[PDB]
Design a protein around this ligand. Sequence first.
Ligand SMILES: *[C@@H]1O[C@H](CO)[C@@H](O[C@@H]2O[C@H](CO)[C@@H](O)[C@H](O)[C@H]2NC(C)=O)[C@H](O)[C@H]1NC(C)=O
Ligand SMILES: *[C@@H]1O[C@H](CO)[C@@H](O)[C@H](O)[C@H]1NC(C)=O
Ligand SMILES: *[C@@H]1O[C@H](CO)[C@@H](O)[C@H](O)[C@H]1NC(C)=O
Ligand SMILES: *[C@@H]1O[C@H](CO)[C@@H](O)[C@H](O)[C@H]1NC(C)=O
Lengths: 250, 212
Amino acid sequence: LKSFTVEKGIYQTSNFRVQPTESIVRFPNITNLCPFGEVFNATRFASVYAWNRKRISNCVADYSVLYNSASFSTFKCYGVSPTKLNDLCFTNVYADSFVIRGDEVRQIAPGQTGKIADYNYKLPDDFTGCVIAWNSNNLDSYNYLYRPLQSYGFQPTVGYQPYRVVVLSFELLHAPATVCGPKKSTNLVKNKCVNFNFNGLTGTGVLTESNKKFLPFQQFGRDIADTTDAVRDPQTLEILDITPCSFGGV
Amino acid sequence: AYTNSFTRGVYYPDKVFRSSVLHSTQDLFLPFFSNVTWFHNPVLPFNDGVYFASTEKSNIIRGWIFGTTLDSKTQSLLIVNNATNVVIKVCEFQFCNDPFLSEFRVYSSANNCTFEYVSQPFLKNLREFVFKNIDGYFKIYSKHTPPQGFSALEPLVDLPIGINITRFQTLLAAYYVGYLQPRTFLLKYNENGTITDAVDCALDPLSETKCT
Ligand SMILES: *[C@@H]1O[C@H](CO)[C@@H](O[C@@H]2O[C@H](CO)[C@@H](O)[C@H](O)[C@H]2NC(C)=O)[C@H](O)[C@H]1NC(C)=O
Ligand SMILES: *[C@@H]1O[C@H](CO)[C@@H](O)[C@H](O)[C@H]1NC(C)=O
Ligand SMILES: *[C@@H]1O[C@H](CO)[C@@H](O)[C@H](O)[C@H]1NC(C)=O
Ligand SMILES: *[C@@H]1O[C@H](CO)[C@@H](O)[C@H](O)[C@H]1NC(C)=O
């Protein structure tokens, strides 16, 4: 009122609003995995003169397992940290798989020179993805040649041992995104004002069981005047009602 | 040979539940009482969303083709509904002059495939369809029913192909083909959330008043 004396009456001073206690995040359930199960996961690698280039698309890429894996001798990523790929999305990913020597591992870099970088797989000067390398003496130590073509002296007995190299090249603008990391889900809590995130739909309120028979294809219900009144739960397909958590003037 | 598209061709536009409400929405719908072409297949344009429908008893119609040039220069969609396993592919196909499949010919020289999808089987029974291509999302609405009367269309798949589609062709005795237009309707939602009735807001002044 901006006065030190208040006349008799009723005055409105502030607003009461309950605050959310916890956030619940939920998303579409885990589906087909990216077939990472097949390159280093593989039996035999092609030689570097005829390296393979496999396209991977329409799958969820969990880079956490490979990044935590200690079997990789080298793991150099450009642009973004390896832990943030779970959030990022791409259009396409290509895997360049071949076998080289450890002394030649330095050639996988933009603007590099050498026999490999000049007569063989050469990287562009522009943005690169991630390069993964490891020593493969046990498995691959004259069957492997390098591009005029010479053979490696792979003797099973450190820089002359075979190294198997996979380059992850990312296409990030070619099409709508279809290869992305997962979405960690959380347990759902009912009958409390919570801060929810259902399959990309955000808001706050209390969630309760509802008797609204949704159709199998709709994902969230909305009442008159364009307000979300109910959503269906992923991972249980239950139909849960949303009510604004209590507020009012004081 | 032409026939009247009596009032068929209305579909749920947004995958949002609403009940006991009248909602006015704008999307590519088939205008009421438009002309629908009846065929007895030649290549047809796809301009902006095409309404299909057929009545058979022996699954004689078995597939579609979608594309731009159909000469392996671009990736072209191919749908071949098998007996139990319907297959959808996107490959730089070479298409025959008159592709047909019980022996098949349209699926030769399958190279540079960029998308593959496998689903559940389709197809006195009228089997309709709606195909729309929006921002690289190809959307199919369908329903098979036992053309007079009203029936709403539920979606089936949404394929993020992102390929520029301009024409199509059908694989094989008669079928109907309509064309969608960007007209606004008034949709009536039953207490169960199903569309029961609709009003073409530019059909006639009475419907204009009803929508207003
Ligand atoms: C998503 O995945 C979860 C499990 O990964 C599924 O939850 C199961 O649901 C059934 C109900 O029929 C329960 O009997 C199981 O105990 C649940 N599993 C767990 C781990 O809680 C859920 O049904 C899946 N949903 C979809 C749409 O795939
Ligand atoms: C149906 O045909 C598709 C290809 O047209 C094939 O992949 C599938 O295995 C077939 N299903 C059978 C033979 O049951
Ligand atoms: C194969 O398809 C890809 C995908 O667009 C395209 O980039 C490429 O030029 C096509 N041809 C060859 C020989 O890879
Ligand atoms: C809604 O569906 C229920 C169960 O299917 C039915 O009992 C009820 O009559 C329906 N409401 C209508 C048709 O208005």
